[PDB]
Amino acid sequence: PATAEPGTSNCEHYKARPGIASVQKATESAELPMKNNDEGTPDKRGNTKGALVNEHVEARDEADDATKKQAKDTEKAKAQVTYSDTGINNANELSRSGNVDNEGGSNQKPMSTRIAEATSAIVSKHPA
């Protein structure tokens, strides 16, 4: 026998003063997790994935890439919070890349064929 009890009636009187649609759209991108960093680590076969590059040249390349990403996210042409060409001589900065393996050697040749050559150097066939 409910005749719509007098507690509730909606008309949307109050509007949000910072704005729900403005705060939530920034919280949606604060919610986003950190980007993965995969290069330097081996795959299922054993090869260290990533590109073949000097590590310091690569660590300068990501400063370039993140400066351009900053310039695009600030909706302009030149970045203002720049990550490269700062005042600091950061000349020993190293990043992970596919140039070195987990042992400490080079990756000019993949590991999955270094081991293949090391085993294929020994075979033994049947006599005629």
């Binding site: 007098p6 009636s9 008309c11 109050y14």
Partner: peptide, 15 residues
Amino acid sequence: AWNLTSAWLEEITPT
């Protein structure tokens, strides 16, 4: 008085 006082109490806003 209910249709007046309920109309006053519903329209109270935080501002």
